[PDB]
Every structure is written in C-alpha cells, then in structure tokens.
C-alpha cells in the first residue's frame, strides 16, 4: 500500500495563534524521553544546560545530568576515562553509529529525536497521532512480524514497537500517567526540543504587531500630509486669444 491518512488537529496549549508552551508539561515530557525513548533514540542537539530556566532549576538540571556516565576527553596516561554528567554535556548516544541501530533494533533505523515535530508533515499532531492512534492490522494484509502496524505511518506497517502504554513512570508532581497524558507531554517537550525560541518569537511577534499598529497609521499620516500638496492641487488651462 501507498495511500495515506493525515493527523487531525489536537488543540495544544501553544499552537494557538500567539500562545506559549506549557512549561509544566515540557518537564513531564523530558521524563518520557529520559527512561523510555533514550534507549533507541538520539537527541544529539539538546544539552542539559538547555533545560535550565525552562522546566528545571540550576540544581535540578545538574542533578539529572550526574545520573549517567559520559566518556570524557583523554587523560595524561592517554586513554579515555568515564565521568559523571555535567551541565554542558549532550544527551546520551545509545548507538555508536546508525549501522548499530540497524542490527540491534529489529532491522529498521530509529531517527534522531531533536527536530522531530518539524521534520514530519503535520508536526506534533502527527507524532501524537502515531503515538496515541495505535491499532490492530486490517483484513487482507498481513504485517511481517519484524514490523508492527500504525495507520498514521506512511507505509501503514514498518519498524517501531510502541512504549506509550499506561504508566511507564509516575509523574514527579501529582499527575495521572495515562495514555493520552504520556503521549501529550513528549510532544509538548519535542516542540521545545525542535523550536526552543517558540516563546520568544511569539513574545516579539506581539511587540511587532503592537509596534506596527502604532507605526503603520503614523507613517501613512506622514505620507498623506506630504502628498496632500499634490492631492488637492487644482489645474487650469488658460490658452491665449
């Protein structure tokens, strides 16, 4: 099969025509990457320092960084040692090369998760629809058992096994870890881990709109008054004889 189906339009707290990200849910979604999608999915472009001021504080971020072994640069002896995580460290690489992703993750290659809500048509709605809209194979077509089944996936079949089932963690601050919650938060995190500037642009965009709303009528008024000498000019032709 080749024929497709598109995501709907789930009403996110940030896809409003001017509205910022839900900062409480960027937090929850980090965890949904941290002990679930960190084991087959790279996030090479997001470091621990990025989480500061956004979801966690300075201490909390350092505390989360220290939780894993990072291969640090060569010592005096000449061999690479292993150290606890600092704030300036990148998110852990599960596979040394994308060829290891092939042999150790059921034939298929899992893509990089930073910039995911911007590299698939429909964005976060698509990822939410792929994550939440899991279902059993249709009649006539048999899924080859080294590949699963999703209606939102372009080829209908292929690759990924789904860990979006009820409660893969308990959320830090009083929150029920349901299917629709655990899918929402990752997406509300992956928006931020694709477009961090989100809030700032929208903040600036409001200022731009308010500036233009003041400036556009005022420049027009400057133009009109200058042009008025021409716009009210009267001609008369007085030929001789």
């Amino acid at each position: 099969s080749d024929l497709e189906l598109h995501p709907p339009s789930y009403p996110w707290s940030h896809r409003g025509l001017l509205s910022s990200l839900d900062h409480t849910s960027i937090r929850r979604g980090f965890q949904v990457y941290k002990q679930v999608c960190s084991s087959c999915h790279s996030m090479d472009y997001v470091a621990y320092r990025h989480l500061v001021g956004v979801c966690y504080t300075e201490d909390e971020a350092k505390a989360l960084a220290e939780e894993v072994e990072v291969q640090d640069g060569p010592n005096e002896d000449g061999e690479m040692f292993m150290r606890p995580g600092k704030l300036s460290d990148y998110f852990p690489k599960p596979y040394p090369n994308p060829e290891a992703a092939r042999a150790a993750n059921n034939g298929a290659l899992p893509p990089d998760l930073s910039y995911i809500v911007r590299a698939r048509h429909g964005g976060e709605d698509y990822v939410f629809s792929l994550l939440t809209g899991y279902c059993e194979p249709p009649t006539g077509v048999s899924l080859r058992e080294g590949l699963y089944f999703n209606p939102y996936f372009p080829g209908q079949a292929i690759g990924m096994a789904p860990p979006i089932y009820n409660e893969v963690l308990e959320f830090d601050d009083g929150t029920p870890a349901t299917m629709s919650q655990v899918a929402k938060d990752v997406c509300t995190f992956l928006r931020w881990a694709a477009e961090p500037e989100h809030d700032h642009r929208k903040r600036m965009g409001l200022k731009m709109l308010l500036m233009m709303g003041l400036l556009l009528p005022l420049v027009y008024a400057m133009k009109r008054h200058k042009w008025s000498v021409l716009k009210s000019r009267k001609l008369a032709y007085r030929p001789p004889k």
Partner: protein
C-alpha cells in the same frame, strides 16, 4: 539623466497648490474612498477575476480527481 528646466516645453497651465499645514491629510476618507474603491473594483473585475475562477475550478477538480483515482471498486 535629465533635470528640471530641461524636460519639455509647457505653456498656459496654472497650478494652484496648498501647504500641508493648511489642509487635512484625510479630507473625506470613507465618504469618498469607499465609493471610489468599489468603482475601481467594478472597473476591473471582468478583466482580472475570470482566469482566477478558471484556475480555482481546475485546482478543485484536479485535486478531487487525484485522490478519487488510485482506490479501486472491483477486484
């Protein structure tokens, strides 16, 4: 390039101008502007609109013929 005083010969045309400080920038902005804008639109609708309608209907049919083609109906 050309400059004023060398452009062309013009005889017998008086022009009366007013200072911008003596006049209003928007004399009758809506009471004359709106009559004018419809008049301007009516002047051109039969000359600009007909190919765009023709495009629009080709666009809407073409896309409807695209999807309603690859799905079957018999075996």
């Amino acid at each position: 390039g050309r400059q004023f005083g060398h452009l062309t010969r013009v005889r017998h045309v008086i022009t009366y101008s007013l200072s911008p400080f003596e006049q209003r920038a928007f004399p009758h902005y809506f009471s004359k502007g709106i009559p004018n804008v419809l008049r301007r639109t009516r002047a051109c609708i039969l000359r600009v609109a007909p190919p765009f309608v023709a495009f629009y209907l080709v666009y809407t049919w073409g896309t409807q013929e695209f999807e309603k083609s690859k799905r079957k109906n018999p075996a």
